[PDB]
Design a protein around this ligand. Structure first.
Ligand SMILES: Nc1ncnc2c1ncn2[C@@H]1O[C@H](COP(=O)(O)OP(=O)(O)O)[C@H]2O[C@@]3(O[C@H]21)C([N+](=O)[O-])=CC([N+](=O)[O-])=CC3[N+](=O)[O-]
Length: 243
């Protein structure tokens, strides 16, 4: 079963603006972990925006489960998809408020469970105020990698069947990243996962990596097969990022 299908997707942001996605054809099986790589501006983020129907393609179809999103309940779609955002944890609100923000009227139990998968529960439990800790620096003063784990928990809180990791902007501390990587298989368990990867190394063990260039998927496959393809863009980007 495919959880995410793109068929002949053409997309531009404004009626006269440039074509950002040209003839995107993609089918992601249920429970697959997909890495998406490519130069800045290749259209990786744009792709995930269409998954959430933040925008509507001029040509082609985006389907979840087989449900064309043109016809799908927008309320249903919001619940299917969890997004791990970057640098979007409200400082003026509590950790629990930041985790349950997408649906404010849930349960402490669901929140904790999400924080546990996120690898955030342990450090939250050791704060004076616990989950009621105001993220802002006049309460305790959390770090970037901590806030990132909260962001993961927020994405996870409603048990989305599809999880999207927005490209990492900032660089995270060792403990956070080690915790995140250690927990990834648990974070991803039972979910169709998309990771937009800054460093190619991040998605090396993805089931499949999608290589985008100038709004096209140019290459796709496992790390090994992508490197085996002579003159592949993938191999070039790997080389550029190698020590
Ligand atoms: N809300 C929005 N409204 C309009 N366009 C949006 C947009 N969000 C993204 N874009 C543009 O679409 C293209 C794809 O961006 P994106 O999907 O974010 O790529 P990555 O995720 O691969 O980094 C980008 O190309 C560029 O701007 C971006 C881009 N860039 O990403 O540096 C640079 C230039 N430029 O220097 O003229 C032009 C671009 N463009 O789409 O015309």
């Amino acid at each position: 079963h495919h959880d995410i299908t793109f068929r002949n997707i053409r997309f531009r942001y404004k009626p006269d603006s440039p074509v950002i996605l040209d003839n995107i054809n993609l089918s992601i099986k249920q429970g697959e972990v997909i890495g998406i790589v490519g130069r800045a501006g290749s259209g990786k983020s744009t792709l995930t925006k269409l998954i959430q129907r933040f925008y509507i393609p001029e040509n082609g179809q985006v389907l979840i489960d087989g449900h064309d999103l043109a016809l799908a309940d927008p309320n249903w779609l919001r619940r299917q998809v969890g997004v791990v955002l970057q640098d979007n944890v409200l400082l003026n609100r509590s950790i629990i408020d930041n985790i349950s923000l997408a649906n404010p009227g849930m349960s402490v139990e669901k929140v904790i469970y999400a924080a546990k998968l996120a690898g955030a529960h342990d450090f939250i439990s050791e704060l004076r105020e616990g989950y009621n800790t105001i993220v802002g620096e006049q309460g305790a003063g959390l770090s970037g990698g901590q806030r990132q784990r909260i962001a993961i928990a927020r994405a996870l809180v409603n048990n989305p069947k599809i999880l999207i990791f927005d490209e990492a902007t900032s660089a995270l501390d060792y403990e956070s990243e080690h915790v995140i990587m250690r927990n990834m298989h648990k974070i991803c368990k039972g979910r169709t996962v998309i990771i937009i990867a800054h460093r190619l190394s991040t998605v090396k063990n993805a089931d499949r990596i999608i290589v985008m260039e100038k709004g096209k998927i140019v290459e796709q496959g496992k790390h090994k097969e992508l490197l085996s393809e002579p003159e592949s863009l993938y191999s070039y980007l790997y080389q550029l990022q190698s020590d």
